[PDB]
Ligand binder design. Structure first.
Ligand SMILES: [Cl-]
Ligand SMILES: [Cl-]
Ligand SMILES: [Cl-]
Ligand SMILES: [Cl-]
Ligand SMILES: [Cl-]
Ligand SMILES: [Cl-]
Ligand SMILES: [Cl-]
Ligand SMILES: [Cl-]
Ligand SMILES: [Cl-]
Ligand SMILES: [Cl-]
Ligand SMILES: [Cl-]
Ligand SMILES: [Cl-]
Ligand SMILES: [Cl-]
Ligand SMILES: [Cl-]
Ligand SMILES: [Cl-]
Lengths: 328, 328
C-alpha cells in the first residue's frame, strides 16, 4: 500500500489553471456569466429575510436556467482576483489582535490601529517565529522547539508589541525585538485595496502581474523569484478566486426598462457555442463580449456554477456588480 | 440569502483545465514525475503489508524530497486518462450485480454474463429509469415518482433481467422491457480496455480525441455534440485522471545497477526551472524529457503530489510503470 497526498499547492495550481484557461492570444477558453428569471419566486421574495430555493444541479436545472436567461456577458481575466483570508494586525474587532502563530499572514498599514508608512499601500507579512514563552497544541510539550519538531503548533503568551514595518532584511526578515520575527511579502496598491479587498479578503497578485509590474506590488526587492518565478500565490497558499463581474444594462436595455421586476438568477458557463442556421452546422465557439440568449446554441457550454437570489432591479445606464467565490 | 452552488461539471472542468494546461508557454505547464530515496524506510520495510509513513506537506518535506531525489521524467498528455468507476452489468463478484438506480453508469459486453455484441468493445450505458416497485431513501414516501420529486433516490425491488444492447433511440434510449430504461453512451476500443482500464475504472475519451475519431469510440451516431462539442467527460461527470508513466532504466543507468537499493518516493512537480550559472540569471523552465536533480534549480517548480511507497528495485533493461490518481 502507498501513502500519497495532494499538497496545498495543488489547490493553488488548480486555481491558476482555471485563470490561465481564459484570455487572449492562442487557443484559450471563453467563459460567461449569465443572468435571468424575471418571474417572481413567490409573493415572498420581496419581504425581509427572504431566500429562494437552492438551484438544482441537474439537466432540468440547466434547462430551466436557459429558459429564464435574459443575457450573457463574457468574463474577462481582469474580473478575476486570487484572494486569501484577511487578518489585520491590531484589529480589536476580532480575537488575538496582537497574538500570532508561525505562518500567519497579516496585514499592516490598512488602518489607524495599523499605520506604519504614509505613502505605501497595505503591507503584508508572514510570521516566521514567535516568543519562546507560551503553549503547544500537543499540551504535553512545554518547549517551543520540541513542539514544532513534533509537528505541534505554538501559541505565544506574549503579544506582538508593534506592527511590523518596512520590507526588512535582504531576505525580508524583520525582528521587532519583542520575540516575534516577520517576513515582508508584498504591498497592495490603493486601487486594489479600496475597490477589490474586503473585510474578509485581500488580493494576491497573479504571477504575470508580478513579472510585469513589481513596483506596483512593492515586490522589486523580492529575491525568492530566483526559485519560485513570482509564484507569490503559491507561497501564501491562495486557493480562492473572487469575481468582480459587471452586468451593464446598456448592452441589455430591454432588461432594464423603468419599473422592471429585476433578475433572480446567475450562472457561469464555460465555452458556450453560437446559434446555428441548421443544428448540424459546424460548432462555432462564442467569443463575443455579450450575447442575447437567443444568439447562442441553447444548452451549449458547461454550467459550472448556479445561484438563485432575491430579485435585484437593473436600472438603465447603470451597472450591477456580481461577486462570486470559487474555492479550489 | 444568496444561494449558490458549484455543479458536478465544475469538477470535470478542473480536471480538463489540468489536462489542457500541459504544454510549452507562459500560460501552460510542464509536469514532471520524480523518483527517489534509496535509503531504507526501516528494517521491516520488506515485510508483507508494510506501509511507509506519509510524506509531509511542508517546506521541510519538499527539501527532503529533493535531497533524496534520483531522477525526474517529463509527463506527456498521452500518459493521462480521464476515468470513472467501472460497474460491469451482472458481475456477481461485486454488490448489486443486477440491481441499478437512475444515473448509474454500467458496462456491458465485457463478459459472457454481459455479452450483447460479438466483435464490439465494452459498451457503456446510463440508467434512465427503474421499476415502480422498490424503496425510497426517504422512507415516508411510497410512490417512486414522488420520491424523486423531492430529491430522493429510488432503489427498485425488481432486478434487471437483461443488459441493454445496441445504441437505442435517435437519442440512445433503450427498453429491455423489464422496467429498466437505458441510454447508450459510448464504446471502448479493445486496446484501451486491455492497456488503460482496470478492474476499478474505465476510460472516458477526452473531447478532442473523441471529436477527432468518433467511430473509434462508437460515437459516430452521437448528436449531442451539437450542444456539448463532444464533451462526453462532462456528460458522465468524469473527475479523476489516472496516470500511466514509465521509468525506464535506460535513462538512469547508474540508478539501476545490479544489487540495487531501489526507489521509495514519487512526487509530481509543475514548472521546475533548469539550473542557473548565477542566481540572478533569468528563469528558464525545464522542457527536456529527463533531468538529473543536479540540472534543475533546487526546490524550483511547485510540488503538487507526494507519495511514499515500499522499495521497488529496478535493474538492467527494466521499466517500472507508475500509476497515480488525481481526483478533481
Ligand atoms: Cl483582461
Ligand atoms: Cl492579543
Ligand atoms: Cl476595481
Ligand atoms: Cl499569471
Ligand atoms: Cl441554434
Ligand atoms: Cl466576497
Ligand atoms: Cl479546458
Ligand atoms: Cl502526448
Ligand atoms: Cl442484484
Ligand atoms: Cl498504454
Ligand atoms: Cl476485465
Ligand atoms: Cl481534449
Ligand atoms: Cl486528446
Ligand atoms: Cl541552479
Ligand atoms: Cl489505479
Amino acid at each position: 500500500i502507498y501513502r500519497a497526498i495532494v499538497t496545498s499547492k495543488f489547490r493553488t495550481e488548480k486555481m491558476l489553471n482555471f485563470y490561465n484557461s481564459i484570455g487572449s492570444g492562442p487557443d484559450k477558453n471563453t467563459i460567461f456569466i449569465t443572468f435571468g428569471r424575471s418571474e417572481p419566486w413567490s409573493s415572498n421574495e420581496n419581504e425581509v429575510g427572504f431566500a429562494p430555493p437552492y438551484p438544482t444541479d441537474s439537466v432540468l436545472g440547466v434547462t430551466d436556467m436557459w429558459t429564464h436567461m435574459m443575457g450573457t456577458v463574457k468574463v474577462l481575466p481582469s474580473m478575476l482576483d486570487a484572494v486569501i483570508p484577511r487578518r489585520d494586525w491590531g484589529d480589536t474587532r476580532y480575537p488575538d489582535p496582537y497574538t500570532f502563530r508561525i505562518n500567519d499572514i497579516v496585514v499592516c498599514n490598512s488602518a489607524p490601529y495599523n499605520a506604519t508608512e504614509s505613502g505605501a499601500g497595505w503591507l503584508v507579512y508572514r510570521c516566521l517565529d514567535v516568543p519562546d514563552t507560551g503553549m503547544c497544541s500537543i499540551a504535553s510539550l512545554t518547549d517551543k522547539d520540541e513542539c514544532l519538531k513534533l509537528g505541534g503548533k505554538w501559541t505565544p503568551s506574549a503579544r506582538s508589541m508593534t506592527p511590523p514595518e518596512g520590507r526588512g532584511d535582504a531576505e525580508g526578515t524583520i525582528e521587532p525585538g519583542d520575540g516575534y520575527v516577520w517576513e515582508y511579502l508584498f504591498e497592495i496598491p490603493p486601487d486594489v485595496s479600496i475597490n477589490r479587498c474586503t473585510n474578509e479578503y485581500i488580493v494576491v497578485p497573479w504571477p504575470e502581474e508580478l513579472k510585469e509590474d513589481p513596483t506596483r506590488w512593492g515586490y522589486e526587492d523580492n529575491l525568492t523569484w530566483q526559485q519560485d518565478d513570482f509564484g507569490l500565490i503559491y507561497r501564501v497558499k491562495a486557493n480562492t478566486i473572487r469575481f468582480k463581474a459587471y452586468l451593464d444594462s446598456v448592452y441589455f436595455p430591454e432588461a432594464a426598462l423603468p419599473g422592471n421586476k429585476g433578475f433572480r438568477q446567475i450562472s457561469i458557463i464555460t465555452n458556450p457555442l453560437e446559434a446555428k442556421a441548421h443544428p448540424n452546422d459546424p460548432n462555432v465557439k462564442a467569443e463575443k463580449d455579450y450575447y442575447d440568449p437567443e444568439d447562442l446554441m441553447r444548452h451549449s457550454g458547461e454550467m459550472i456554477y448556479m445561484e438563485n437570489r432575491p430579485p435585484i432591479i437593473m436600472a438603465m445606464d447603470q451597472t450591477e456588480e456580481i461577486n462570486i467565490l470559487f474555492t479550489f
